[PDB]
Amino acid sequence: DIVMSQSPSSLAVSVGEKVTMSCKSSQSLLYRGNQMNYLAWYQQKPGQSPKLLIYWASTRESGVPDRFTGSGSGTEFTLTISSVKAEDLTVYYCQQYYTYPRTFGGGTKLEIKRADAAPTVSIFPPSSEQLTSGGASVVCFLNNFYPKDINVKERQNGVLNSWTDQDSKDSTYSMSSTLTLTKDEYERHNSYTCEATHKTSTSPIVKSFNRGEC
Amino acid sequence: EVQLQESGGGLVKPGGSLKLSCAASGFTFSTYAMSWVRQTPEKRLEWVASISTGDNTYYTDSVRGRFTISRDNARNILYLQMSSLRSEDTAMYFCTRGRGDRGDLFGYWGQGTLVTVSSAKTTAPSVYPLAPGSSVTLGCLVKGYFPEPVTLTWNSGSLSSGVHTFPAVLQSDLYTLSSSVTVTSSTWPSQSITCNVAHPASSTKVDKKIEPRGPTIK
Amino acid sequence: PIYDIN
């Protein structure tokens, strides 16, 4: 029941820098009889299985880049990233295989921070089909932007939202918008608008329309 | 060249039973010792079971008695039988193969099969097409489907970039899930674009063709 | 009146 601890919780890096990972252990994964550290690192690109990065706390798994190095021993281990790319935007985990149960840490999310981008919007009325079943939901779409720090908006009695994890390609985020409503209550008003408020958007960015039925 | 494919996940009500199946190809199957790992909804990874080169089984305490791990070297398959599922066990399930002819190190990984345990009822999804001079965008909406997951593709998967599929959102046992896709105005509706969606274990498979809304009142 | 797809 060895307890793994990874710190810090969040992070922020930019392409080219160095990255230091910290795996704290509740026991020694080093065995005097073979002088071996029973520890392994992982990288899990979002939406996929993890890949085995480092094992025996130091040895690179075949196909692992040279810009990854494993060090440390015993109870306090360290993952080395020489040059951080954007193909390394993910989470990272450490595990032990000394004894059972096999244990993982709390992970560490590196949120890259490259450049403030411009959020592309696109507003969408309910479909000529959703209204026909009962209900309606406008949608507006934020796409290809940084930072993740932008909220968006006048009666707001029940919406839903959804963010993408950062794109591994252009270091962006993206946002959904489930402006759900009653079908007939959607006719009680005419003018329908979303609006964003970015870090570079003092004067907000808007997309709007009027109810196509008036 | 080392492929691990999980099978048979989905939904069970509490106290139920599920037998997962990991099908391996591309190596001497009996030479390595395999295992299973799950990932909590809070994205936390938990070890589950391991089975040695000689069938010595090893389980984490939270699943002892309920879960039984079993390998059949003949057909290159590994099983995790999960009886009496607790609400905790809702997670994504990976099989792993040993790193080398050695212990249970998680060298290679399957893609993961999801096991959801509410009591709630299997419901197929609805699909509602978001139809609306530089570049136009259109979307696809999936209001109300359970259990998770579903697979949204654009033009039978032929549409690569410009897609920003969003994580599902459960509210009242019905997951809501959108997706955005962008092309030059010269593209749509010049070339047909269809939302393709599959919901497993409801055995449904839906394709909703994106058409312009058309001016018809009365 | 499908007010203008886009």
Side-chain angles (χ1 to χ4, degrees), chain A residues 2-108 110-112 115-153 155-182 184-186 189-198 200-214, chain B residues 1-137 139-218, chain C:
Chain A
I2 326 174
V3 170
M4 310 291 97
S5 300
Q6 321 201 190
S7 294
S9 36
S10 83
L11 206 50
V13 82
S14 305
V15 182
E17 288 182 23
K18 68 194 302 154
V19 196
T20 48
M21 228 72 58
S22 72
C23 184
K24 198 268 311 164
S25 168
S26 55
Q27 192 179 307
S28 180
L29 317 167
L30 173 48
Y31 166 45
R32 173 172 187 183
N34 59 9
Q35 289 310 302
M36 289 307 284
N37 305 310
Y38 283 56
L39 181 123
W41 287 105
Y42 295 95
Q43 161 210 94
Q44 180 194 39
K45 308 162 180 169
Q48 330 188 5
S49 69
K51 189 169 71 173
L52 172 51
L53 251 53
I54 285 299
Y55 67 100
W56 299 123
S58 56
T59 308
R60 297 166 256 258
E61 162 68 337
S62 50
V64 157
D66 319 80
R67 36 201 165 82
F68 293 114
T69 323
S71 36
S73 182
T75 48
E76 296 176 3
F77 304 83
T78 279
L79 179 70
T80 290
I81 296 187
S82 324
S83 49
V84 47
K85 319 183 86 290
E87 69 176 15
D88 314 323
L89 308 189
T90 166
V91 280
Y92 285 89
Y93 290 99
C94 65
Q95 93 154 0
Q96 56 98 359
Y97 40 98
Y98 214 61
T99 62
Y100 300 97
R102 307 297 185 239
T103 323
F104 294 94
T108 294
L110 57 150
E111 308 150 322
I112 219 174
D116 299 65
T120 294
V121 200
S122 298
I123 176 165
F124 290 83
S127 71
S128 295
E129 327 169 11
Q130 190 189 356
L131 306 137
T132 325
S133 54
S137 312
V138 194
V139 170
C140 34
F141 275 150
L142 282 307
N143 302 303
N144 303 321
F145 63 94
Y146 173 91
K148 31 102 173 190
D149 310 310
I150 167 174
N151 207 40
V152 154
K153 175 173 69 180
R155 192 166 65 193
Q156 263 59 55
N157 178 21
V159 201
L160 293 90
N161 211 332
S162 208
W163 288 254
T164 40
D165 307 327
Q166 223 194 80
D167 199 332
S168 69
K169 313 219 87 172
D170 65 306
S171 323
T172 180
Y173 292 78
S174 297
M175 306 178 170
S176 147
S177 65
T178 313
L179 251 180
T180 320
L181 241 183
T182 325
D184 43 358
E185 263 91 337
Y186 177 59
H189 302 259
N190 282 291
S191 194
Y192 281 82
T193 311
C194 308
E195 184 186 76
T197 37
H198 216 197
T200 52
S201 182
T202 64
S203 36
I205 301 184
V206 317
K207 247 76 178 177
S208 162
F209 68 98
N210 254 277
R211 172 179 178 68
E213 197 58 27
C214 201
Chain B
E1 297 185 19
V2 166
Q3 290 156 346
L4 309 173
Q5 284 307 272
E6 289 101 351
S7 324
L11 173 134
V12 200
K13 295 192 188 194
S17 289
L18 241 193
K19 200 180 183 179
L20 304 175
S21 303
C22 174
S25 79
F27 59 85
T28 315
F29 183 78
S30 45
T31 60
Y32 317 93
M34 322 192 61
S35 36
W36 284 90
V37 171
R38 83 193 189 191
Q39 184 168 11
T40 73
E42 324 89 42
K43 298 312 216 62
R44 221 159 81 259
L45 279 93
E46 289 169 327
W47 172 68
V48 182
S50 301
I51 182 162
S52 72
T53 175
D55 304 274
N56 310 125
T57 62
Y58 302 78
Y59 315 83
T60 173
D61 278 348
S62 80
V63 310
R64 258 190 171 292
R66 328 201 295 236
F67 297 4
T68 304
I69 185 184
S70 47
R71 72 184 288 155
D72 183 8
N73 305 335
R75 287 182 244 274
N76 300 22
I77 319 179
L78 165 59
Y79 313 97
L80 177 60
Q81 184 171 86
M82 311 172 43
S83 314
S84 324
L85 271 43
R86 273 197 59 95
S87 172
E88 331 295 300
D89 311 355
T90 317
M92 174 78 65
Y93 286 69
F94 301 92
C95 50
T96 81
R97 197 219 77 184
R99 172 87 192 313
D101 51 341
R102 74 181 221 71
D104 59 41
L105 191 40
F106 308 135
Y108 299 83
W109 291 57
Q111 73 288 8
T113 179
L114 166 49
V115 174
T116 325
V117 291
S118 267
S119 203
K121 299 158 299 186
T122 58
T123 80
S126 305
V127 181
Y128 304 118
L130 281 183
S134 48
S135 304
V136 81
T137 299
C140 181
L141 174 40
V142 188
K143 187 267 165 303
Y145 74 90
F146 186 83
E148 240 186 322
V150 285
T151 307
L152 205 165
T153 49
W154 283 116
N155 279 9
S156 306
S158 315
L159 310 196
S160 165
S161 46
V163 192
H164 284 176
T165 300
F166 291 101
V169 184
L170 180 136
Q171 178 188 11
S172 309
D173 310 74
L174 285 186
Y175 281 96
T176 304
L177 174 140
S178 50
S179 181
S180 164
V181 49
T182 303
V183 278
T184 322
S185 294
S186 48
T187 323
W188 185 89
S190 316
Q191 314 188 235
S192 168
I193 292 180
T194 300
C195 186
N196 324 117
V197 158
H199 194 304
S202 57
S203 293
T204 75
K205 225 191 307 292
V206 176
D207 320 295
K208 215 76 87 162
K209 173 173 157 73
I210 279 275
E211 282 282 285
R213 54 186 87 271
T216 37
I217 39 175
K218 257 174 206 76
Chain C
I2 37 163
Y3 209 124
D4 162 274
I5 38 174
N6 257 357

